[PDB]
Amino acid sequence: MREIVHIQAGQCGNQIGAKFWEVISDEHGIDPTGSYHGDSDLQLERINVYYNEATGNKYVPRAILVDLEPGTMDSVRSGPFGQIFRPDNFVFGQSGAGNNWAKGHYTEGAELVDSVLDVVRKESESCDCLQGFQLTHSLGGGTGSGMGTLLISKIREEYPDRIMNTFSVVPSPKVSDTVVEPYNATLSVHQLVENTDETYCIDNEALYDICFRTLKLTTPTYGDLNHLVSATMSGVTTCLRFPGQLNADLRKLAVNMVPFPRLHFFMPGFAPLTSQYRALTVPELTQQMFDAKNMMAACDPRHGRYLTVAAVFRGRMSMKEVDEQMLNVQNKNSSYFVEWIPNNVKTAVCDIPPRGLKMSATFIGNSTAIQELFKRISEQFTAMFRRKAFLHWYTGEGMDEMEFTEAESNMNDLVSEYQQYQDA
């Protein structure tokens, strides 16, 4: 099991996805046209996880670009690393999704979904041993939310035994396109609970506050929000992309991180937070990555308990001092880690650091506090839904009010389920 197939859905999906590929191509020494111009053999030793090798020794990403309008995917092609993606893997409709789940899932997206899966199959067929799939998308809009969750269901039908990861940008009024986002998010969450093994909850509320408060950016763009995401995305995928001895796959992570199948909603963190000259000591990275300020999902981890943690330190450092520091926060704050899962924090180290920093730390937490994020969207949903506000946009595409009442209830059970183990 080596190969991962990547899909990126809609505006946000394709935007953060582009940056993920820009970031990791740089770490692997792969230039904008697809040729390798690095130095180490360690850059190429697990390049087959995210790249196909082409004629004339070009490296092309195993990446499929999906949208219901040509806007964003045109910008990706014009953008800095656009010439590397296989042009056949640009699959786009024309009419758009209008920030409407129904359009993405049931009508406009239904028309395009088969043509997307053909390319998925095309990239899968030439995988020595396909391990799984990862999707970048948002739950607030139409395409990424609706069509993204449809593709997830189609991919599961056709490849029911592979791993399905998502990097899912959860919405927020602080960084809002449209009032209907909580509807879209809530319909998507119900899908993700069934059809994904891991879902990385990127919350736009959190990314804003990190950009605003802890980076001193007064007026942050989506660009500033996506820097944080593409750094985090490089961080969690480090151990797949590099050697070694203590090397990794998706399924073992999914197994060890997810004690109950519906509870697979992780809370990312990164340290230090960038947009520097003093390198951080190991005790600082450990303090920072566990800080609520560094979390990408706007939840206070003190309001719940960790079921499992996974931590990935990058850089040349004392593995003695990492162990010692990781054992310090566990032994000094043991009330916030469940007692009934022994040794539930796993640490890995990787010698290659990311562009800019001499040593970093990425944090993956399956905390019960993540219920707060779903409670927030569940409140935003009901304020509107209790007056059937804005439903005409969805019922016009064939949707029923029953489907909304279901998706509401499924997510309120998810919050109950997370609350259950926060007390036990």
Partner: protein, 53 residues
């Protein structure tokens, strides 16, 4: 303390010293390997039924 059964050779030697005196079949296996394949195949069928709905 008695040093009994002393045996010697060119590469080594050995002795005892005493301080003080006082399976299921091929059928049964292949059966329940396949019984695990039933429940595996039932779960997958349940899923693809659920996905059809």
């Amino acid at each position: 303390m008695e040093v009994i059964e002393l045996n010697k050779c060119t590469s080594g030697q050995s002795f005892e010293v005493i301080l003080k005196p006082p399976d299921p079949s091929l059928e049964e296996i292949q059966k329940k390997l396949e019984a695990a394949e039933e429940r595996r195949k039932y779960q997958e069928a349940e899923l693809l039924k659920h996905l059809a709905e």
